[PDB]
Each structure stands twice: as structure tokens, then as C-alpha cells.
Amino acid sequence: MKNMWKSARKIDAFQHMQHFVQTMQQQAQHAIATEDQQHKQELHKLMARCFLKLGEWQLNLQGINESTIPKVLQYYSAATEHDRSWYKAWHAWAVMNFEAVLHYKHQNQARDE
Numbered sequence: 442m443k444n445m446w447k448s449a450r451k452i453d454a455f456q457h458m459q460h461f462v463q464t465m466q467q468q469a470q471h472a473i474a475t476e477d478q479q480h481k482q483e484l485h486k487l488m489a490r491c492f493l494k495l496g497e498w499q500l501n502l503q504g505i506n507e508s509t510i511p512k513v514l515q516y517y518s519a520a521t522e523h524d525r526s527w528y529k530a531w532h533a534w535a536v537m538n539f540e541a542v543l544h545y546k547h548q549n550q551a552r553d554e
């Protein structure tokens with residue numbers, strides 16, 4: 442999916458990743474067993490990575506605006522939740538809040554004009 446994102450099929454990659462995250466969340470909900478602890482942990486890490494890629498691609502395509510910020514914050518909060526001990530997810534979430542607040546400042550300045 443990442444490769445096909447790199448191969449100019451960006452919107453298709455984003456849609457496929459939406460579907461994949463939904464499917465894998467359903468699988469994780471269905472994955473309820475004692476032996477499945479390590480597999481569930483790996484799947485949670487994969488969900489974190491998928492959500493991080495979701496946010497990155499959402500910014501790459503739709504940019505940053507009033508509509509995009511809630512969705513991307515949801516994606517990054519989910520990514521942090523699935524894998525709390527991951528540096529990339531937390532850094533992406535924090536810098537995303539940073540970008541959102543700077544964008545709010547800039548549009549406020551535009552309003553002032």
C-alpha cells in the first residue's frame with residue numbers, strides 16, 4: 442500500500458488504507474484469545490503505523506484546513522493510543538497540533554486584514 446502510494450496512486454492508496462484500517466480494527470475486535478497476546482500487540486503496532494500514514498497522506502493530499510485538522514488529529518490520537526511507546530506517532534501528533542495552531546494564527550491574521 443505504501444509502494445502504491447509512492448507510485449502516483451495517492452488517492453487510491455488513501456482509500457485502500459481507510460478500508461484496511463477498518464478491516465484490521467474489525468479483526469482486532471474479533472481477535473480475542475489468550476495465545477493471541479503477542480499477535481494482538483503486533484497488530485496494534487500495525488494500526489499505529491497505518492494511522493500515522495493515514496494522517497501523513499491526508500495532509501499530503503488535502504493539505505491543512507478546518508475540515509482536515511479534526512480528521513488528522515483523530516488519526517494521530519488513534520495512532521498514539523494503539524502504540525503509546527512509539528516516538529514517530531507522538532512526534533507526528535504533537536507537530537500536527539503545532540501546525541494546527543500556527544494555521545489558526547495565520548487565518549486569524551487573515552481575518553484581521
Ligand SMILES: O=P(O)(O)O[C@H]1[C@H](OP(=O)(O)O)[C@@H](OP(=O)(O)O)[C@H](OP(=O)(O)O)[C@@H](OP(=O)(O)O)[C@H]1OP(=O)(O)O
Binds near residue numbers: 443494
Ligand atoms: O519497519 P518498516 O516497515 O520499514 O517501517 C519503519 C517506518 O515505516 P512507516 O513509517 O511506513 O511505518 C519508517 O518510515 P518510512 O521511511 O518507511 O516511511 C522507516 O523509515 P524512517 O524511520 O526513516 O521514516 C523506518 O526505518 P527504515 O528507513 O529503515 O525503513 C522503519 O522502521 P525499521 O527501520 O525499524 O524497520
